Amino acid sequence: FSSAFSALAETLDNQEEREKLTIEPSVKNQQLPLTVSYVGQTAEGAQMKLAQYIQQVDDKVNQELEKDLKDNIALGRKNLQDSLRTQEVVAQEQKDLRIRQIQEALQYANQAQVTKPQIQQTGEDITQDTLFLLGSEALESMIKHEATRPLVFSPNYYQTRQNLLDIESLKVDDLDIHAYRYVMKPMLPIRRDSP
Amino acid sequence: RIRQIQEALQYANQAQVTKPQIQQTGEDITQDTLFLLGSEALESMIKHE
Amino acid sequence: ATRPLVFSPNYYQTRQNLLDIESLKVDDLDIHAYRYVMKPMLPIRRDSP
Numbered sequence: 001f002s003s004a005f006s007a008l009a010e011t012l013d014n015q016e017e018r019e020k021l022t023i024e025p026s027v028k029n030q031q032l033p034l035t036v037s038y039v040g041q042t043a044e045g046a047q048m049k050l051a052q053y054i055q056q057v058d059d060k061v062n063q064e065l066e067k068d069l070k071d072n073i074a075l076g077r078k079n080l081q082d083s084l085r086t087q088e089v090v091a092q093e094q095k096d097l098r099i100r101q102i103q104e105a106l107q108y109a110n111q112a113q114v115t116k117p118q119i120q121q122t123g124e125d126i127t128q129d130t131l132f133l134l135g136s137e138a139l140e141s142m143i144k145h146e147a148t149r150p151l152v153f154s155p156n157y158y159q160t161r162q163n164l165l166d167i168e169s170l171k172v173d174d175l176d177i178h179a180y181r182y183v184m185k186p187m188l189p190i191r192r193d194s195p
Numbered sequence: 196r197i198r199q200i201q202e203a204l205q206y207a208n209q210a211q212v213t214k215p216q217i218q219q220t221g222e223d224i225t226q227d228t229l230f231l232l233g234s235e236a237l238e239s240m241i242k243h244e
Numbered sequence: 245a246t247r248p249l250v251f252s253p254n255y256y257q258t259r260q261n262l263l264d265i266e267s268l269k270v271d272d273l274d275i276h277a278y279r280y281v282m283k284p285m286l287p288i289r290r291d292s293p
Binding site for chain 1: 202205207209211216219220231
C-alpha cells in the first residue's frame with residue numbers, strides 16, 4: 001500500500017494542474033502508523049477527495065491480490081495433481097516388485113511342499129524369506145489375480161492428497177483482503193494553510 | 196480397505212480357508228495375510244460395506 | 245539369480261525425486277523478473293529548456 005500510494009503521488013504531478021498528495025511515517029523513529037495528506041481548495045472538497053484516493057489505491061491492491069491468488073491456486077493444484085501421478089508410478093514399481101517376490105516364493109513352496117498356510121499370524125508385513133509359508137495354493141492366486149491386486153500408498157501420499165482437497169476447496173471470491181486500517185478517519189480542516 | 200478385502204476373498208476361495216486361522220495380530224492386518232480371516236468372515240465385510 | 249533385490253526407502257525417495265525432475269516443463273513455465281507498480285508515464289512538463 002505504501003508503495004502503491006506513493007506511486008499515485010507521482011501520477012498526480014503529471015496532471016496539467018498539480019494535486020499534492022503525500023505519505024510519511026507519523027513519528028520519526030518507527031515505520032508505521034503512516035500519515036497520508038492532500039491539499040485542496042475547499043474544506044469539504046479536500047476531505048472527500050482524500051477518502052476517494054484512499055479507496056482508489058485500496059481497490060488497486062485488492063484486485064492485484066485476488067488476481068494473484070487465483071494464479072497461485074490454479075497453479076498450486078497443478079503441481080499437486082502431477083505429484084500424485086509420479087507418486088503413483090512409484091507405488092506400482094513397489095507393487096511390481098511384490099508380485100515378483102510372490103512369484104519366487106511359489107518356487108520355494110513347491111519344493112518344500114507347503115500347500116495349506118502354516119502362518120498363524122504376522123506382527124508386521126511378511127518379508128521375502130518367510131513369504132513361502134502362505135502356501136502353494138494361496139500364492140498361485142496372488143499371481144493369477146495380479147492386475148486387480150490393489151496398490152498400497154505411503155502416508156505421505158494421503159498427506160499430499162489431503163493437501164489437494166484443501167487447495168480445491170478454498171474460495172477467493174468471498175475472501176476479503178484489506179491492506180490498511182483507519183486509526184483516524186480523514187478529517188476536514190478548520191484552519192487553512194495559505195493565505 | 197474394502198478393495199483389499201474383496202481381493203482377499205479370491206485368495207481364501209482357492210486356498211479353502213473358511214474358518215479363521217488367525218489366532219491374533221499385533222498390528223493391523225496387511226494385504227497379503229488378510230485371507231487368513233476366512234472365506235465366511237470376508238463375505239460379511241463386503242456385504243456389510 | 246532370479247531372487248529379487250530389496251530396496252531401502254531412501255531408494256524409492258530418490259526414485260520419486262527423478263520422476264519429479266523428468267516431469268516438469270520449462271517451455272510453458274513463465275518467469276517474470278519485475279512487476280509494474282506504475283506503468284511508464286508520458287510527461288506533461290519538459291525538463292529543458
